[PDB]
Amino acid sequence: AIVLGRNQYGKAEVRVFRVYRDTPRHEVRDLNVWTALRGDFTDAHVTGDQSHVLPTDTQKNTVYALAKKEGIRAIEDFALTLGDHFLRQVPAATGARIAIEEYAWDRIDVDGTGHDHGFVRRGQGTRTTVVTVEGRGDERRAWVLSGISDLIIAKTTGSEFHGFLKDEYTTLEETHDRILATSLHTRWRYLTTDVDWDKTFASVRSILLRQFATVHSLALQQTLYAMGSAVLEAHPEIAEIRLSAPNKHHFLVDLQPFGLDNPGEVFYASDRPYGLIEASVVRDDVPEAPEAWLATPGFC
Amino acid sequence: AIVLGRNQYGKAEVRVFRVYRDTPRHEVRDLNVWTALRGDFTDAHVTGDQSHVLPTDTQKNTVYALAKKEGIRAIEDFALTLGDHFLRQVPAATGARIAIEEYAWDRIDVDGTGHDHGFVRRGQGTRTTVVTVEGRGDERRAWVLSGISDLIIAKTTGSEFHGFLKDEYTTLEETHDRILATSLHTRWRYLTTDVDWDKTFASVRSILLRQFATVHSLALQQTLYAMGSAVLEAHPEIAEIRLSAPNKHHFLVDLQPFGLDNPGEVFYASDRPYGLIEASVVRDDVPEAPEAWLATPGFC
Amino acid sequence: AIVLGRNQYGKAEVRVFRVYRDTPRHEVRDLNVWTALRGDFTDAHVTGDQSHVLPTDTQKNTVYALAKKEGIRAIEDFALTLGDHFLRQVPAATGARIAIEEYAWDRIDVDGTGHDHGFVRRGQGTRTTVVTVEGRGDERRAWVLSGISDLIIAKTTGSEFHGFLKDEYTTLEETHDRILATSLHTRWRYLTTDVDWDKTFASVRSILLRQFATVHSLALQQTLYAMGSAVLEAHPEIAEIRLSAPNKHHFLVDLQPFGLDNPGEVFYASDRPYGLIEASVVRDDVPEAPEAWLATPGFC
Amino acid sequence: AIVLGRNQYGKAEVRVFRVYRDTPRHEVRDLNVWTALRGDFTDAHVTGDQSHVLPTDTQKNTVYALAKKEGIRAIEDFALTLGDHFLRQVPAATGARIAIEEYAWDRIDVDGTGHDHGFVRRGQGTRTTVVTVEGRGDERRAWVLSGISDLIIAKTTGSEFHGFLKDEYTTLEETHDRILATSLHTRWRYLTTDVDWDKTFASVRSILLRQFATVHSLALQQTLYAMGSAVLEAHPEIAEIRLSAPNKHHFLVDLQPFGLDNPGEVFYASDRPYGLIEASVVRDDVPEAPEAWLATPGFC
């Protein structure tokens, strides 16, 4: 009684660089795109008949083709267009998952103004989206996740951790002052697809950064909740936000062996291990949408 | 109505290196360990009261302590032991997810025999486990996933891909002979925890490699199914197996511009993009265990 | 006739995070430090007598100790202080090489102003230094290299490549318009150590960026020369600059198979292979200083 | 008086995968190739006249073409062939540096015999070469470096470190038993180009591993010298060998706080910082060949 279960296939990490150059002031969209189709590909696995299978090579061609034919503004719209496109090309497909990450570029400063066609990478986190489209016509449903990854941030005070559970293996001293440093990975789910994607992203990003800096932290857990709840309070169109934050320990070096004090000044920035504190903040009044999250961050 | 939803926390990437040295012939266990606790940590997020929280630093200490107290044989047993231990130490916790990677070492060859205490990394893929323990006493349940990651394999013939769906964006030529190269990521779920972990792991690994080599491939999809089904047929104790394989494209380089033939000999190994083909092989007569897979491969 | 040749040893990648907090407006210095000592360590290699050897563990302790005792302003001064320090502690040492890289942080924007103690990584290249100190007292000599690494930049026009040598293996079409994208690695050597390190670095960085953007490029070779010569013309205190630039090819995708034009708009950003164009611009009137560059970028 | 100084250019990281398939028992050569030309390319930098420049794209084409035309046996011979070829094609070039890494593959085991066309990556370090060719005809000279990179090895005893210099910043305890773990990077220079490259490589690798295992270590310094000298004593055709070894610290974890002993059994494998111990072993009766080492490991 051995059968094929869940499966998906597509092209991973299609790097597409789109330039808008209708005026001498160029704009760039720098994208990394994943496609994944789902549906009746059973025979392709069990017997090797590829009749239903649209090659991943073609899914890559389609990314580049539509980059010209449809354009690339907000990555959520581009992902939605790709999802609907593959459903129209692949009758055996029941759904498509399109994930995109965008690398931001600034203009190189020349004599106090940004150059028309010279750019430098901004380097402060990746804007992401994960779009799922299922069905066709009146039964078509779609879900949009957006997110930020590798947003590297730190507080040098305003961070405490005390009153925790102490067991026989606990050696950690309580503290009222420590560094809190992380590299934030977050994704949030929109209630519908009728959203000003760029406006909401800029506001969410600003809210997460501001809350991180200004909330007095009693634990990374409490910081993440304050960040996520501030986002949902400001954005009724967002159903839920998941946050994943390493606690990149900066250890206060003991300089007493060298005859020196260390009043919170000299730290060893440790690579591994790191705390990993992960939390979701949700609207209690809307249904969950597990289809939006299937195979996020990955299949297995 | 904004509330804390799913959450977990713990120590990530604890590198523990355990030496067995009861005799001059030492053995090594080289591990990377993640802990993650789930339970009633709501107050720790919402008000900042850490009374329920066993610090991630303590969870790190526990890995090293139990590596001596309990030893490290099969990583599945060590992960099961850590899971039960944390539930004993943290009353608010309802469950624990313990994930481990093991890096295999061989003995250095000296006059045709492995040296007593000198080793070299084996380098052929990581052995993995993901162990979840929920509840205590009679209500306790546990699940074991084991797996292999970064197993880099290739066939230089016995691979085809033809008769696929062709649309207006398709330029891929059908082929009856190509390279098939991948880096296998796989995880499988055991029906129970009464398993000879090392014997089954070694068998699964050899079935995967043997099926990959000897099965004539009509598509990566079909190779993955053939590998997965053979594992399930040889191991009734395994409920399901998920395979994730990039199709690392080796393009036959066009040498005609240089006055040369290229009959399947000279290839360009492209990095990105790559096909990503993902399949699940399951026993239809056993129920699913979503608990085993929760937050695998990640939380969000 | 087998003897020990050149050798050096020290601690690599000491991550030191220094916080200045005498006022509530904190400042951060985020550093990665390499030490390497040179001298009479022959017996330590040949017979294993470690009498001359100061442990790398101590060289690490010394980084953290001096971070408090001497402070960390410009990384060149900190590296010079470390070099002279190790010569005073290690009588067998004849020289010391201290390399440092600095990761820049900005203040998180809160209500239009930078927060007192909350920061985000700037993410636009690494400031580097390589300081070599040899001898003691009146025979002491020192050399300072500074540099930038991983400065990711791109032009979307103003870049040509034509009139090159065409041989029987050449398939490249000449072009008067292409993308030129790179990740710049550069190091330059100062004539003396009497330099305002921070002021010169900011000006050099600005000159390299401006020249990249504004010079009409006939080849990456010609761009790198225009960048390096502009730096030396503006900075008589700099003896030479070496630049190493990958040509990260952005290939104009052929969309004619899909019935579309591509007037310089849709590109495939290729990972590997990449051109690697490397050049030095030098003052013809000052002597070379090979001691400054020994074991840069590495020993072997 | 600002002038162009040293420069070189070429194609970096050309991944060529060559299959030998004269019989059904295929063999594979899996290579990463760098080309770099040196010569009279001054005009190409200063005025932008590319007449002398053979495009890096052509240099890429030449790797694939000669992989068929000439074949790929030992990477040293292939690199020598590329070096001479470019000097034939590029009159302005005075020299070429060709560097290659090879990734070893094993045959997949099927019923105790290696499969005809199914392979798995060996995973134990990269075989390397760096070949420099200068001049043409009677004035031609060439040099071959071969090497090994990322060879991950460890001993769990037979390593000590005591009797070192102790200063006011030293806290390291002397020890008579510790783990010694490293990832070896080494390059050696052949006296001539009349060498059985594969036989010598295999011998050098086994001497390095065997000496590491069996030599009782008083310091990494002394282990490296013992490895290097043994290679030179067994291979008169090798002029010199440079070794670069991180001391990847495995700290004995203090388990006393948990009521436990730890007699050399449980270790924390730290990532950074790490000792970096670098030594050259040379024949004092042969002259140096700086030309062989120019821009190794990099240009700047």
Ligand SMILES: O=c1[nH]c(=O)c2[nH]c(=O)[nH]c2[nH]1
């Ligand atoms: O904010 C924190 N939460 C934790 O759970 C924890 N655990 C730990 O060791 N340090 C911290 N910090």
Ligand SMILES: O=c1[nH]c(=O)c2[nH]c(=O)[nH]c2[nH]1
């Ligand atoms: O085995 C394959 N499956 C695919 O779906 C596919 N798509 C593609 O372009 N090549 C391949 N190969």
Ligand SMILES: O=c1[nH]c(=O)c2[nH]c(=O)[nH]c2[nH]1
């Ligand atoms: O600016 C360039 N220099 C080159 O040497 C070269 N070679 C190549 O293929 N493209 C380019 N571009």
Ligand SMILES: O=c1[nH]c(=O)c2[nH]c(=O)[nH]c2[nH]1
């Ligand atoms: O073999 C060693 N050499 C050193 O120089 C050194 N320094 C140190 O701290 N440990 C070690 N070990």
